[PDB]
Design an enzyme around this catalytic site. Structure first.
Site, PDB file in Angstrom:
ATOM      1  N   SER A  36      14.219   0.038   7.320  1.00 61.26           N
ATOM      2  CA  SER A  36      12.845  -0.420   7.884  1.00 61.26           C
ATOM      3  C   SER A  36      14.041  -1.593   8.944  1.00 61.26           C
ATOM      4  O   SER A  36      14.389  -0.909   9.153  1.00 61.26           O
ATOM      5  CB  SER A  36      11.802  -0.864   7.293  1.00 61.26           C
ATOM      6  OG  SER A  36      10.664  -0.897   8.419  1.00 61.26           O
ATOM      7  N   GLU A  50       4.984   8.088   8.014  1.00 66.56           N
ATOM      8  CA  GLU A  50       6.172   6.709   8.728  1.00 66.56           C
ATOM      9  C   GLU A  50       4.781   5.912   9.068  1.00 66.56           C
ATOM     10  O   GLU A  50       4.670   4.960   8.381  1.00 66.56           O
ATOM     11  CB  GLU A  50       6.798   7.125   9.319  1.00 66.56           C
ATOM     12  CG  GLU A  50       8.416   7.670   8.666  1.00 66.56           C
ATOM     13  CD  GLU A  50       8.993   6.301   7.664  1.00 66.56           C
ATOM     14  OE1 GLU A  50       8.824   5.576   7.996  1.00 66.56           O
ATOM     15  OE2 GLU A  50      10.131   6.620   7.541  1.00 66.56           O
ATOM     16  N   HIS A 104       5.516   4.199   4.210  1.00 63.99           N
ATOM     17  CA  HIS A 104       6.724   3.955   5.160  1.00 63.99           C
ATOM     18  C   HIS A 104       7.200   3.005   4.032  1.00 63.99           C
ATOM     19  O   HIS A 104       6.622   2.006   3.337  1.00 63.99           O
ATOM     20  CB  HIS A 104       6.372   3.014   6.645  1.00 63.99           C
ATOM     21  CG  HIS A 104       8.000   2.427   6.708  1.00 63.99           C
ATOM     22  ND1 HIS A 104       8.128   3.287   7.752  1.00 63.99           N
ATOM     23  CD2 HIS A 104       7.683   0.399   7.388  1.00 63.99           C
ATOM     24  CE1 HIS A 104       9.453   1.407   8.068  1.00 63.99           C
ATOM     25  NE2 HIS A 104       9.020   0.879   8.037  1.00 63.99           N
TER      26      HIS A 104
HETATM   27  N1  LIG Z   1      -5.094 -13.469  11.050  1.00 59.20           N
HETATM   28  C1  LIG Z   1      -3.603 -12.810  11.017  1.00 59.20           C
HETATM   29  C2  LIG Z   1      -2.461 -13.807  11.662  1.00 59.20           C
HETATM   30  C3  LIG Z   1      -2.021 -13.646  11.805  1.00 59.20           C
HETATM   31  C4  LIG Z   1      -0.481 -12.988  10.818  1.00 59.20           C
HETATM   32  C5  LIG Z   1      -1.581 -11.855  11.182  1.00 59.20           C
HETATM   33  C6  LIG Z   1      -3.894 -11.897  11.174  1.00 59.20           C
HETATM   34  C7  LIG Z   1      -1.140 -10.421  11.158  1.00 59.20           C
HETATM   35  C8  LIG Z   1      -2.160  -9.115  11.586  1.00 59.20           C
HETATM   36  C9  LIG Z   1      -2.860  -8.870   9.935  1.00 59.20           C
HETATM   37  C10 LIG Z   1      -3.655  -7.904   9.266  1.00 59.20           C
HETATM   38  C11 LIG Z   1      -3.974  -7.508  10.546  1.00 59.20           C
HETATM   39  C12 LIG Z   1      -3.592  -7.208  11.387  1.00 59.20           C
HETATM   40  C13 LIG Z   1      -2.391  -8.320  12.151  1.00 59.20           C
HETATM   41  N2  LIG Z   1       0.260 -10.233  10.978  1.00 59.20           N
HETATM   42  C14 LIG Z   1       0.749  -8.533  11.177  1.00 59.20           C
HETATM   43  C15 LIG Z   1       1.709  -7.925   9.832  1.00 59.20           C
HETATM   44  C16 LIG Z   1       1.306  -7.100   9.557  1.00 59.20           C
HETATM   45  C17 LIG Z   1       2.362  -6.184  10.171  1.00 59.20           C
HETATM   46  C18 LIG Z   1       2.868  -4.711   9.071  1.00 59.20           C
HETATM   47  C19 LIG Z   1       2.229  -3.953   7.567  1.00 59.20           C
HETATM   48  C20 LIG Z   1       3.097  -3.510   7.407  1.00 59.20           C
HETATM   49  C21 LIG Z   1       2.553  -1.967   6.531  1.00 59.20           C
HETATM   50  N3  LIG Z   1       3.785  -1.137   6.541  1.00 59.20           N
HETATM   51  C22 LIG Z   1       3.874   0.492   5.597  1.00 59.20           C
HETATM   52  C23 LIG Z   1       3.578   0.257   4.301  1.00 59.20           C
HETATM   53  N4  LIG Z   1       5.140  -0.875   4.049  1.00 59.20           N
HETATM   54  C24 LIG Z   1       5.148  -1.791   3.363  1.00 59.20           C
HETATM   55  C25 LIG Z   1       3.882  -3.091   4.014  1.00 59.20           C
HETATM   56  C26 LIG Z   1       4.684  -4.434   3.775  1.00 59.20           C
HETATM   57  N5  LIG Z   1       6.184  -4.467   4.296  1.00 59.20           N
HETATM   58  C27 LIG Z   1       6.916  -3.584   4.260  1.00 59.20           C
HETATM   59  C28 LIG Z   1       8.177  -3.810   4.045  1.00 59.20           C
HETATM   60  C29 LIG Z   1       9.495  -3.156   4.374  1.00 59.20           C
HETATM   61  C30 LIG Z   1       9.249  -1.869   3.659  1.00 59.20           C
HETATM   62  C31 LIG Z   1       7.687  -1.425   3.758  1.00 59.20           C
HETATM   63  C32 LIG Z   1       6.922  -2.433   3.323  1.00 59.20           C
HETATM   64  C33 LIG Z   1       3.549  -5.008   4.865  1.00 59.20           C
HETATM   65  C34 LIG Z   1       2.500  -5.613   4.559  1.00 59.20           C
HETATM   66  C35 LIG Z   1       2.097  -4.209   4.000  1.00 59.20           C
HETATM   67  C36 LIG Z   1       3.042  -2.617   3.620  1.00 59.20           C
HETATM   68  N6  LIG Z   1       4.827  -2.080   6.513  1.00 59.20           N
HETATM   69  N7  LIG Z   1       4.452  -3.075   7.193  1.00 59.20           N
HETATM   70  C37 LIG Z   1       1.521 -11.212  10.622  1.00 59.20           C
HETATM   71  C38 LIG Z   1       2.205 -11.025  11.615  1.00 59.20           C
HETATM   72  C39 LIG Z   1       3.397 -11.773  11.301  1.00 59.20           C
HETATM   73  N8  LIG Z   1       4.840 -11.583  12.264  1.00 59.20           N
HETATM   74  C40 LIG Z   1       2.617 -13.514  12.155  1.00 59.20           C
HETATM   75  C41 LIG Z   1       1.992 -13.598  11.391  1.00 59.20           C
HETATM   76  C42 LIG Z   1       0.486 -12.665  10.868  1.00 59.20           C
END
Ligand SMILES: Nc1ccc2c(c1)c(-c1ccccc1)[n+](CCCCCCc1cn(CCNc3c4c(nc5ccccc35)CCCC4)nn1)c1cc(N)ccc21
Ligand SMILES: Nc1ccc2c(c1)c(-c1ccccc1)[n+](CCCCCCc1cn(CCNc3c4c(nc5ccccc35)CCCC4)nn1)c1cc(N)ccc21
Ligand SMILES: *[C@@H]1O[C@H](CO)[C@@H](O)[C@H](O)[C@H]1NC(C)=O
Ligand SMILES: *[C@@H]1O[C@H](CO)[C@@H](O)[C@H](O)[C@H]1NC(C)=O
Lengths: 536, 535
Positions: free
Chosen positions: A200, A326, A439
């Site tokens: 990623s 993905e 992912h």
């Molecule tokens: N109300 C708020 C306030 C702050 C933030 C919020 C929400 C969100 C948000 C949460 C839920 C819905 C909409 C928005 N977010 C959004 C974060 C969500 C976006 C990423 C989720 C995601 C989903 N995936 C796919 C599945 N696998 C993973 C993940 C996650 N991390 C990783 C990391 C590496 C590889 C894989 C992987 C984490 C989340 C779940 C699945 N990767 N990442 C924030 C982000 C910031 N940088 C700062 C503040 C906040």
């Protein structure tokens, strides 16, 4: 005191800990400082090398996780919590970890260096899925992983300023790489055979080191899993980082010129910055991140697009690939109609609306083009199709097509490229069936976790993980993922622009396929830019 | 005296027909029956007037003059082209029709089939060998009627809004022939209350225009459209564009264009061959599948664009059979795309493919052409000259016929029509076009008309049975509005085309196979995306 667990590095002495892998012992050195804590006036600043220490430094536990947002969408659900910080948060986080065989290798061993993902807003080298134990024990590898600063701390930029030049989290990584050159031999690593690998954002980071001259003398091969330096989320323009940094400052009361603005940001508690991180994004979206590498004219001399189009990649070997689904898991982070707790069967209207969010930069015409392409005109209103298509849209735009153009450009320009698609869904997966192979869910397997019997992976999965560890370490060793003994097929062919061969990684023996989503990526890489390009 | 079965009276006057031989036995034929006053002299460009009654017995034993018309000379002596060329004298005096009936004439009133030929609105004739009604008449018991209608400038040159050149007069010729069937066909044993129009290419588009034009609706009951539609890029023109072409043609034969009476008067003094010699020079771009003088959206015959009329029409009672051949575009390519010939394999380069796309889609901006090219490229083998040749053919076929047909079937089916749909996939063993062209535009007709039944024509036994099968679908459809045989349980069924299921059938040597979506992914590109471009 165990002599195998005492090491002298440039900065002083270190004590590791003998850990148990199922096949036997490994030596681990965790929490090794590679930089001066980037705290106080060092916030937003390029990292400085760690000063020498007296006595023996305790390197037996993971050190603090870099300050970052913690996920709260699904509290206590494994599928999210597994990516959440597993140590204390702190701005003081510039440490790396080394796993070696026990006893330490007799002759210099290829080194793998892991760079984690998390959208450049999160991650840590201490998560259980990045456990270097298995690779060290079975394949005899020296595995290294560093923490790097993320979110505002790693990537807030006021471009052209002395005190927030941007890209510092990429400089953290570069410093860990230098640390490896100077020190890894003391662990029995070969500084002359360093393979970067990452997923990623980590994969985009590896990409950035390929594209940045000062990084090039620090590794010899690269692996980019589900991420690229090109594409719509991995970089921002200088003009755009300045807008977001400026906006973040406004949001937290700063200022009451660049110097003043950054000095006031520096007085703010870390959580204040994380509190307003999400509010600087220009559009409602998914798969977009507030603070990412900036095209600065320095670390990145031009856009990754311009750099990949014109680079010389002659003595470079690259392994790249994607997973089967993905975009599925991203959909629940902003697309109305999607949840992990039901089957997420959407309407057509919900699909058009979701496209504006999956492709946040698309004009009406461009989004229409996306919609018209991904619709199954035989079943135009079937909710299962529409859902799978929404996921497909997000995967393709953000990962699969950027990967396909990276592969083609590298191959065409002298590099040796190997590509894959990973299609096995983990029996232990806690996300629902409709998300498929989401992912991030190959990592688990590359790192060899199914070999831990307490984790309840099936026998087939253990053999599978053994195969993957062998491809990745074969690649680190030689630049060719094929087993140079055996002798029987099917051989993993290099990816080329003519043939476009890649392989399916799953429970069946390797299958050779041609064309990485070819018609669809042509849509994204050749047509859509032209849209969108000259109008508007 | 004189065969008593060959003497018939029409509105009209007395006719003497001819007993012809078909393989199964005799048929009656009444060829060259006039239905309009000769549209000559002060009458060129004018709507037709009914034929004035004659005295004595009109001889109706030979085909009459073909409407005046460009003669193909690209491949001289070659049967693939000569089969479409005029087979009688060219004259402006050409408004005649033909009737084939069983011999002796039917006891009870028989379903009537009226054929309308294609030829891009610039050519064609009802007297061509492939339009011979003898087999349908003898084998199916059908009453078959075909008419000549004016083509090219004579049929379609228009100065919209004028008295002297209102436009669409070739369509009006066809309507007059339809009116004639209403008044007279009962004299031959035809049933005026069961008339089915069928035609191919411009004939098919014509059929569609009668469906869309109110005064024509009371003159037929069912319709068959083969490889053509009233909607799409070539079958019509705006009022403005027809004015522009008429005026330009006028200049070229000048006739310096300054009201409309003066100009038509001058055009009227020009010799026929002279109008034909300049017809081609009024096309706005280098192109294929575009014709100079075609039906115009006049706000009269055609009250609005065919697209507007199909999108909003109510077609509750209408039964239509629609379809295409496997290789609609292939033969069009040798008439203007550099790189294509009938005498070689026509393997082309990528440059020649891009250049061809601009000619095949002449109305397209640079953005649209690049869209076409990217859609049709095989990204795995983007330089393969065989694939490029085939893509160029599909680009032309899809844009001009397949997708306008799919659009048509979709709209009709959504708005009350019973629609049956086919793809015709058999290459005549007797074809003289090269093998690369597949099943070209026009080459199902031969089979619908039952030509393979003539043993002197050298078709195979299976082709004979296949032609029998097809004549049977077409005449079942004319008869009942359903191409299926009611008695025949075992034979596979031909389901209607719906929006929900998008079913159509393969017509080839094999028993009917039901397929889904004609041919959905690509036509969504042409009918949904491309307009929205483009523009
Ligand atoms: N109300 C708020 C306030 C702050 C933030 C919020 C929400 C969100 C948000 C949460 C839920 C819905 C909409 C928005 N977010 C959004 C974060 C969500 C976006 C990423 C989720 C995601 C989903 N995936 C796919 C599945 N696998 C993973 C993940 C996650 N991390 C990783 C990391 C590496 C590889 C894989 C992987 C984490 C989340 C779940 C699945 N990767 N990442 C924030 C982000 C910031 N940088 C700062 C503040 C906040
Ligand atoms: N130098 C000149 C001068 C005048 C004309 C010329 C050329 C051409 C032309 C000839 C060769 C190459 C490019 C252009 N043209 C171009 C017409 C050529 C396009 C039609 C050819 C064609 C090809 N197909 C598909 C295959 N089957 C058929 C045909 C033809 N007719 C029919 C009719 C119904 C169904 C099928 C069928 C006739 C020709 C060959 C194949 N249909 N029609 C003219 C046209 C006019 N209206 C008037 C004048 C001229
Ligand atoms: C076929 O003939 C045409 C016209 O004579 C020519 O332009 C073309 O290059 C030829 N194609 C091949 C494959 O030889
Ligand atoms: C049909 O077949 C014979 C060969 O048996 C040939 O000599 C004759 O000329 C052919 N007729 C046609 C119309 O092809």
């Amino acid at each position: 005191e165990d002599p195998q667990l005492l090491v002298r590095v440039r900065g002083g002495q270190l004590r590791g800990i003998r850990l148990k892998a199922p096949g036997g012992p490994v030596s681990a050195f965790l929490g090794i400082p590679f930089a001066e804590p980037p705290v106080g006036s060092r916030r937003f600043m390029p990292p400085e090398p760690k000063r020498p220490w007296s006595g023996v430094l305790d390197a037996t536990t993971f050190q603090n996780v870099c300050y970052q947002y913690v996920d709260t969408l699904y509290p206590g659900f494994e599928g999210t919590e597994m990516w959440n910080p597993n140590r204390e948060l702190s701005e003081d986080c510039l440490y790396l970890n080394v796993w070696t065989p026990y006893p330490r290798p007799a002759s210099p061993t290829p080194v793998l260096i892991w760079i984690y993902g998390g959208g450049f807003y999160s991650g840590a080298a201490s998560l259980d899925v990045y456990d270097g134990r298995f690779l060290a024990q079975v394949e005899g590898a020296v595995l290294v992983s560093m923490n790097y600063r993320v979110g505002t701390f790693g990537f807030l930029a006021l471009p052209g300023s002395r005190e927030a030049p941007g890209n510092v989290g990429l400089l953290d990584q570069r410093l860990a790489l230098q640390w490896v050159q100077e020190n890894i031999a003391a662990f029995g690593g070969d500084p002359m055979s360093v393979t970067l690998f990452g997923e990623s954002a980590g994969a985009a980071s590896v990409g950035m080191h390929i594209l940045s001259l000062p990084s090039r003398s620090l590794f010899h091969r690269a692996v980019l899993q589900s991420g690229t330096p090109n594409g719509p989320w991995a970089t921002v323009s200088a003009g755009e980082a300045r807008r977001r940094a400026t906006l973040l400052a406004r949001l937290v009361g700063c200022p009451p010129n660049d110097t003043e603005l950054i000095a006031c940001l520096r007085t703010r508690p870390a959580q204040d910055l994380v509190d307003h991180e999400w509010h600087v994004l220009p559009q409602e979206s998914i798969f977009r991140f507030s603070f990412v590498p900036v095209v600065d004219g320095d670390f990145l001399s031009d856009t990754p697009e311009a750099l990949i189009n014109t680079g010389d990649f002659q003595d470079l070997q690259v392994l790249v690939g994607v997973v089967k689904d993905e975009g599925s898991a991203f959909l629940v982070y902003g697309v109305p109609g999607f949840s992990k707790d039901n089957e997420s069967l959407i309407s057509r209207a919900q699909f058009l609306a979701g496209v504006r969010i999956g492709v946040p930069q698309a004009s009406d015409l461009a989004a229409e083009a996306v919609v018209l392409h991904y619709t199954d005109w035989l079943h135009p209103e079937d909710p299962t199709h529409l859902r799978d298509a929404m996921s497909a849209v997000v995967g393709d735009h953000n990962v699969v097509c950027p990967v396909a153009q990276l592969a083609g450009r590298l191959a065409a320009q002298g590099a040796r490229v190997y590509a894959y698609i990973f299609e096995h869904r983990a029996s232990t997966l806690t996300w629902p069936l409709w998300m498929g192979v989401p992912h991030g869910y190959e990592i688990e397997f590359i790192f060899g976790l199914p070999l831990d019997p307490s984790l309840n992976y099936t026998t087939e999965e253990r053999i599978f993980a053994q195969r993957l560890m062998k491809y990745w370490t074969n690649f680190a060793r030689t630049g060719d993922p094929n087993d140079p003994r055996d002798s029987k097929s099917p051989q993993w062919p290099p990816y080329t622009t003519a043939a476009q061969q890649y392989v399916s990684l799953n429970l069946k023996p390797l299958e050779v396929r041609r064309g990485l989503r070819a018609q669809t990526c042509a849509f994204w890489n050749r047509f859509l830019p032209k849209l969108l390009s000259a109008t508007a």
